[PDB]
Design a protein around this ligand. Structure first.
Ligand code: CL
Lengths: 592, 590
């Protein structure tokens, strides 16, 4: 029930100072952190950068694999000019679980390590003095929290995780920490939808505030020129001769919201950039601004060698440099909400994102049978609400993914899907498509939930998990056989392939190819391309993965996952040049 | 004028302008005639801090040499009207001109030390303002680090450095928006003495007014243990907790301006360590006991940021250096981000702080009309470095050149001058030195009287007597070590470069150069030599991690002499030092 997830801005009514830097850090295996006073703060631990996953900074494995309570400590200054304002610490992500103490006093908890949350500390600090913030984070996985997984205990006592997902359990203060001072009466939320008529457009907005003061809304273009204004919390901004936002061709207008009448100084100002564009599913078409498009891309994680799962602006800007070069125009934020700065860059660069909530693991290799479904569901729907509230105004969000590879064959999955889909059908004012990925075991013959998603996202791995090597010929025929069945039943919704590919160890070559070589990656991708091109209802290809990424140790995991088109260092495998050639030859309206 | 690191309290603010700026190349040099100083948004987004080179897919951009432009909007709070407003640039590589709201404020030379611009009268308090930076990354023999800029037959400009590392350029370190008091602390100094279990911090405080000064020192739990009034004074610490190698203890210093009656005018706080540094003949003494240096050998180089400071890589580099048993490193070949020293202070490492006086030699140099301006910029960057890093307990010595061409008798006037103009800059009077290249030896070097201790760069078994010849290379190194011993060497000797390129994964039995085994073989050889001579008081191997470099047929995608890979995983040579260095006590050879 987060009152507001607006991204921090700086103006005369709102301040935002980052608390990033080095913190004190201590493990707590015994769980006696609070018994012995760590919540008042400490400086007898190890320095830990923020934001950063804490796991890879340690040379010993038990610390890399640590599972339990852990503590971050820091001092921060509160200016005396802040007295009277609404004061918040905004945590952009604490994986997975956090209790926040300021000066020894408990402020709040939070569940879910991938969305932001703020702590009202207005009453917990001395103004004009140094205060202390302590974070008691937790790490464990259970089937009652997203991402789904288990926590086991080695015979020697140490806890460790057995995830139901691929990626590594990178943990800790994974994203920035802000100190905010906001007006007492302020903007909490706003919403935008768009309509196009001829060369003109209309933004339809609403604004939520914690009070009754008047609301002025003003829309300015790229050069600061005001082009529409309106009064009140509902309204319609008329933009004549609009500059539409276009795939791989962004145009962003600045939106400005202010509280007060013209006898006041503005009691609050908020500011955000939005793109004027519309998204419709029509038949099997995905329409952006009423012309069909064809998705090309990935397939991503937030993973980097030094930050773990933490947001790094350098790695993010290179991922976009690469993705623009290679011809992509879309990617899915698998398998969890990304740092907010990523959606701002997709807006700036004209990319189409599939925003995913962290519901991986709904799949035991009897899931929906059990009793952890009650608590799991609360957290799932709550994480879906907060995700849609945070990112709804980004032009680059195209669709919401509400599961990843859930067990759709279990008939008991249908009551759960009915509930999730019912409870979310109206969260997004733009009413974009809501979907999920179907795993390989989940086909037109075996899935029970094919009626729900607004378009289809298939995860197919012929040539890797099935029909590998010289059997690849049988795998293509068996995929063509499935795609034949969709066609017969007459798919009325678009189909998008969202995973496929091949683990590839850069530098491994063979002629002829063998699984794991660079040549085999290309043969596999060429094979998929031949299938995609032979069916009109296939409307996009998102390969797995963009880069190689870290993973739980295992005998099938050559240090992480290696399915990337690029290495973890962000350099290209042979498959990168394949797609660089294919994707820059496919137009935006491919198949139409 | 002041290089103090920004702090946050009720008198001083500090807000980073890091994030995505706008970016454009200006190969033509038309940017100012085109009105770009007023800000622009028609370029490409570029992270700050970070080198811009590695974000482009084309080589022409990656290698670009000339004028480049950064542009950003920022907000100046109404509440800041009346304070001294500053844009502080932590590093702009290598040249900058600063514009605010289209108005040219300031320029700067040198790409690895911070500078501040007073923008108090160039902004609209309470609205958005524009900052534009016009950077240049050309090299010449008149600027540090030294090199040349050439034009290809196709018009494009290209740099050809006199040093190894790549020409990573742009906004390589954070940008701060500061709010300072009108009367404020500008500088302070610390020196230490010991007596029994007691110590004496001897301070001074530079100010730009006459208001009274008040200094207080508190221990790690916040208890106050000494106060004093006046711009000079001595704090008496009873039963002091000394700052020890790999065993730091940091007191908090608090400078406060204003008399007992008024509102405080300025507060400045820093963390210092109580410890002394003396060169006693051939020993290096920290707190009057002899130490033995072990370490690297470093660069500020990471895959995604390039030259730019990245706190994740830095804490990881420090995690590794403690794991391996090291206790020192040299900031080759330029001052590092200021965070590196604060971590060094908290972890009790000893740093050799190096100014970017690299490439003073060609493949002569001191016999050219470029020295006059070169020397201006050289001694100025020396002054800025010592002024910035003075107060760190962890800075052990200053390095004033890396591999200058000391064979020519003309180097001697220039050294004479550099060494006289730096004589009395560091209040602690720590030792000033420089690295001697392979060609500069006891037989051939002409500047051996100057340094306070000797830093040796030797590459037997790599650039000479490679492969099966290594045994003759070991013999030659002992030859030279015999001649030092003969010459009655009275100052300490520290090996500060040695090693071997190693491609992680290349194995051979028996070894060949470039394999992991050969590297261990080479490092074992150097160890055997170091252990048979008493004046040798330190081994700093080159390099800590594989770092990026100019393209060349001898550069297998950058330098590869690193004990760790560019991703910071170990090569077999990691475990050799992990064994050796964790068995040498801190007083080895005493
Ligand atoms: Cl208070």
């Amino acid at each position: 029930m987060e009152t507001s997830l607006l991204y921090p801005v700086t103006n005369d009514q709102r301040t935002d100072q980052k608390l990033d830097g080095l913190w004190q850090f201590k493990f707590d295996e015994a769980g006696e952190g609070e018994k012995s006073g760590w919540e008042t703060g400490f400086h007898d631990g190890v320095s830990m950068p923020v934001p950063a996953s804490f796991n890879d900074f340690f040379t010993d494995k038990a610390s890399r694999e640590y599972t339990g309570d852990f503590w971050y400590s820091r001092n921060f200054f509160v200016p005396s000019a802040a007295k009277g304002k609404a004061l918040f610490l905004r945590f952009d992500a604490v994986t997975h679980r956090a209790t926040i103490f300021v000066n020894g006093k408990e402020i709040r908890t939070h569940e879910g390590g991938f969305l932001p949350f703020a702590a009202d500390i207005s009453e917990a600090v001395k103004y004009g003095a140094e205060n202390t913030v302590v974070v008691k984070g937790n790490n464990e996985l259970s089937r009652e929290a997203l991402p789904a997984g288990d926590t086991i205990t080695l015979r020697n006592g140490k806890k460790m995780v057995r995830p139901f997902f691929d990626f590594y359990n990178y943990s800790g203060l994974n994203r920035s920490v802000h100190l905010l001072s906001l007006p007492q009466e302020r903007v909490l939320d706003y919403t935008t939808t768009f309509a196009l008529a001829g060369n003109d457009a209309t933004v339809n907005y609403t604004v939520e505030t914690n009070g009754d003061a008047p609301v002025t809304v003003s829309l300015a273009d790229a050069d600061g020129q005001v082009v529409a204004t309106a009064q009140g919390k509902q309204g319609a901004l008329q933009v004549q001769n609009a500059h539409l936002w276009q795939v791989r061709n962004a145009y962003l207008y600045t939106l400005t919201i202010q509280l007060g009448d013209d006898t006041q100084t503005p009691l609050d100002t908020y500011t955000d950039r939005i793109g004027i564009r519309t998204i419709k599913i029509s038949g099997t078409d995905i329409l952006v601004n009423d012309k069909p498009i064809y998705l090309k891309g990935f397939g991503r994680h937030e993973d980097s060698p030094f930050a773990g799962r933490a947001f790094d602006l350098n790695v993010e800007k290179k991922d976009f440099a690469l993705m623009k070069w290679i011809g992509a125009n879309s990617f899915r934020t698998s398998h969890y909400p990304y740092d907010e700065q990523v959606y701002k860059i997709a807006d700036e660069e004209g990319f189409l994102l599939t925003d995913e909530v962290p519901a991986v693991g709904f799949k035991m290799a009897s899931f929906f049978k059990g009793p952890w479904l009650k608590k799991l569901h609360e957290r799932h729907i709550d994480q879906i609400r907060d995700l849609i509230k945070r990112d709804k105004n980004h032009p680059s969000v195209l669709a919401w993914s509400l599961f990843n590879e859930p067990d759709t064959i279990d008939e008991n999955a249908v009551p759960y899907f009915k509930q999730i889909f019912d409870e979310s059908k109206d969260l997004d004012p733009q009413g974009r498509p809501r979907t999920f990925t179907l795993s390989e075991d989940d086909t037109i013959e075996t899935s029970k939930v094919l009626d729900f998603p607004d378009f289809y996202m298939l995860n197919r791995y012929p040539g890797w998990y099935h029909f590998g090597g010289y059997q690849i010929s049988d795998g293509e025929a068996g995929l063509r056989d499935e795609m034949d069945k969709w066609q017969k039943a007459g798919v009325k919704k678009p189909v998008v392939f969202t995973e496929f590919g091949a683990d590839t160890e850069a530098g491994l070559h063979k002629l002829p190819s063998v699984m794991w070589t660079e040549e085999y990656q290309v043969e596999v991708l060429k094979m998929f391309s031949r299938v995609f091109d032979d069916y009109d209802f296939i409307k996009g290809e998102q390969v797995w993965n963009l880069a190689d990424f870290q993973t739980v140790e295992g005998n099938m995991r050559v240090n992480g996952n290696k399915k990337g088109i690029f290495t973890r260092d962000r350099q290209p495998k042979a498959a990168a040049f394949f797609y660089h050639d294919r994707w820059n030859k496919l137009p935006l309206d491919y198949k139409a």
